[PDB]
């Protein structure tokens, strides 16, 4: 029965039981957890328990601002740079899967509905030193699959209808709230299927669950010297509803595209040994020596 | 009281009598899609007893070195009976499931079956960066076998899979598990040929063991779709 | 003693579970030591392409 819980439950005092009838012995096979109370197992005292439960609220457990993107690029003249390089601008398809602390926390659930509070920290380093330029950056939110700019002075940066944020390095970090955007009532943290009508689509990736694109340029023309500009994107989920909890990820993540697994070479978190080994089942690992 | 159980759906009936008090997934019973959650505006077909009935799959041989078995829903049923025909003739699908997993043996046999229904069991592959293909995931009525059931083939854990709707078949206690699944999707309905809402996983946590006469011990899966809706009628795909 | 007849398996298994009760509380939220990385994951660069 659903109830409001702000503190952990009190313990009632209990006495000696010696009864022939009603049971510390439950039924595992029903899939139910043991409802055996400590009052029924040992002889207890009354404890008025004032321990709050608010820090394990799913809103508090997930509304931590976590690093989701970290991109360095050269801020310089890119007349003669490679066609792979971020030429004063990068684009980033927003995902929660590239950094494993946020990834494992969000993958504790099957479905998540949250607004995405996006914080953008920019740091700059000179590639001799003459000082750091207070550069203006543009972060433009582009939807999944939509047109992203192809150069720094692209006419896609005009943002007639795309939301752009302009921000300076000397400023506080740029901060935007992206709404809950999904075409569904929740994001699918795990998607058991293909999101395409042919059989060649990607498994596990529903583009409904992709927030969108951060297209981040430097608005400034290049300086006579080069700079390395590191953009860090932080996401805080908020107004979070979470559904269907899952086993946590035990093995190391291999990719962001899937739930592929290798494990570590030895215990802990190996394919065939998640917990580190002890010598025997009757060996106590941190036995007090007296 | 908990052992005796009678399951009548349509023309199908199951009497299990070594059961262990059936699991309703997340305390939720299957319902039809209400009007305040509905999206597709055409009148759905609700075939009732033509689809809301137990579908028995092929039995699997519980053997000594078995790792586990999985079936994905609705994919295990998308080609069976009038459920499969309503799946193949409609774009949209919504149902719950009544899963009844059956495995008996003697009073001299030992063995525990974790029978667990996993929502959105996005399978990972082992020792590669390539995602599993269509043929690895969409096995249909035959189902698949767990590669590494200890991490549930997704880098997580068998040990914490009791967070999902599950029962056990401990051969001491019971011979049947019964999980009642509601609709479990972020969307109201779904295209049943490219998405699986539930994966029934059946895993030997304790292996089959005896010292009596060795018989084939099978695990039989009977799945009843519950409260089937089908929208977007067209030709058969 | 574990006392089985001749046609039972002579070795039997115990599965142990643990849960918390409802007097359970957790404070002071920290990063989990159970997951980690020392690289970028595979295909994480493809999010920039």
């Amino acid at each position: 029965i659903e109830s409001i819980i702000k503190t952990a439950t009190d313990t009632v005092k209990s006495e000696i039981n010696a009864e022939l009838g009603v049971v510390s012995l439950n039924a595992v096979e029903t899939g139910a957890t043991s409802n055996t109370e400590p009052e029924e197992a040992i002889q207890t005292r009354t404890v008025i328990n004032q321990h709050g439960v608010s820090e394990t609220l799913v809103e508090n457990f997930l509304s931590r601002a976590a690093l989701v993107s970290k991109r360095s690029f050269e801020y310089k003249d890119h007349t003669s740079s490679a066609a792979q390089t971020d030429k004063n601008f990068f684009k980033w398809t927003i995902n929660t899967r590239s950094f494993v602390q946020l990834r494992r926390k969000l993958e504790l659930f099957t479905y998540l509905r949250f607004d995405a509070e996006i914080t953008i920290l920019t740091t700059v380093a000179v590639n001799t030193y003459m000082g750091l330029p207070n550069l203006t950056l543009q972060a433009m939110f582009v939807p999944t699959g939509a047109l992203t700019p192809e150069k720094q002075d692209s006419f896609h940066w005009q943002s007639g209808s795309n939301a752009s944020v302009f921000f300076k390095i000397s400023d506080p970090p740029a901060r935007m709230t992206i709404p809950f955007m999904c075409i569904n009532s929740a994001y699918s943290v795990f998607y058991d299927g293909f999101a395409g009508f042919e059989k060649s689509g990607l498994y596990g990736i529903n583009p409904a669950d992709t927030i969108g694109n951060l297209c981040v340029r430097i608005v400034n023309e290049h300086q006579p010297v080069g700079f390395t500009v590191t953009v860090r994107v932080y996401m805080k989920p908020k107004h979070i509803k979470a559904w269907a909890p899952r086993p946590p990820r035990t093995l190391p993540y291999m990719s962001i595209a899937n739930a592929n697994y290798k494990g570590k070479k030895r215990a802990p978190n190996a394919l065939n040994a998640i917990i580190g080994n002890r010598d025997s089942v009757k060996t106590m690992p941190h036995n007090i020596v007296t | 009281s908990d052992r005796v159980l009678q399951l009548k759906l349509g023309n199908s009936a199951i009497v299990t009598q070594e059961a262990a008090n059936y699991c309703c997934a997340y305390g939720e019973w299957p319902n039809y899609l209400p009007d305040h959650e509905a999206v597709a505006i055409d009148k759905p077909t609700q075939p009732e007893t033509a689809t809301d009935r137990f579908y028995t799959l092929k039995s699997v041989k519980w053997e000594a070195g078995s790792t586990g078995w999985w079936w994905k829903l609705p994919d295990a049923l998308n080609n069976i009976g009038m459920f499969g025909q309503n799946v193949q003739h409609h774009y949209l699908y919504r149902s719950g499931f009544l899963i009844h997993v059956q495995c008996n043996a003697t009073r001299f046999h030992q063995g525990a079956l974790l029978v667990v229904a996993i929502p959105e069991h996005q399978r990972g592959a082992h020792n590669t960066n390539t995602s599993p293909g269509f043929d690895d995931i969409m096995k249909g009525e035959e189902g698949g076998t767990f590669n590494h059931p200890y991490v549930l083939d997704d880098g997580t854990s068998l040990a914490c899979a009791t967070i999902f709707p599950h029962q056990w078949i401990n051969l001491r206690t019971n011979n049947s598990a019964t999980i009642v699944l509601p609709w479990m999707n972020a969307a109201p309905m779904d295209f049943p040929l490219r998405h699986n809402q539930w994966t029934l996983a059946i895993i030997p946590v304790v292996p089959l063991g005896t010292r009596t006469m060795s018989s084939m011990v099978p695990i039989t899966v009977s799945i009843a779709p519950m409260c089937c809706e089908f929208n977007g009628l067209r030709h058969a795909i | 003693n574990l006392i089985v007849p001749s046609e039972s398996s002579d070795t039997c298994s115990l599965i142990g579970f643990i849960a918390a009760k409802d007097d359970f509380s957790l404070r002071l939220m920290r990063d989990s030591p159970d997951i980690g990385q020392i690289d970028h994951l595979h295909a994480a660069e493809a999010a920039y392409q």
Binding site: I1, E2, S3, I4, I5, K6, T30, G31, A32, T33, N35, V53, S54, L57, E59, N60, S63, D115, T177, P179, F180, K236, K238, H239, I240, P245 | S1, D2, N21, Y22, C23, C24, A25, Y26, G27, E28, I163, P165, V180 | A19, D22
Partner: peptide, 30 residues
């Protein structure tokens, strides 16, 4: 405090103390 016109813009809602653990600990029917 929120001076934005969208309700999703607001701060986090750390006020929902409703629990129903029995849908995970007792998902049984009898």
């Amino acid at each position: 405090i929120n001076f934005y016109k969208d309700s999703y813009a607001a701060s986090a809602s750390k006020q929902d103390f409703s629990q129903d653990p029995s849908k995970f600990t007792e998902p049984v029917v009898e």
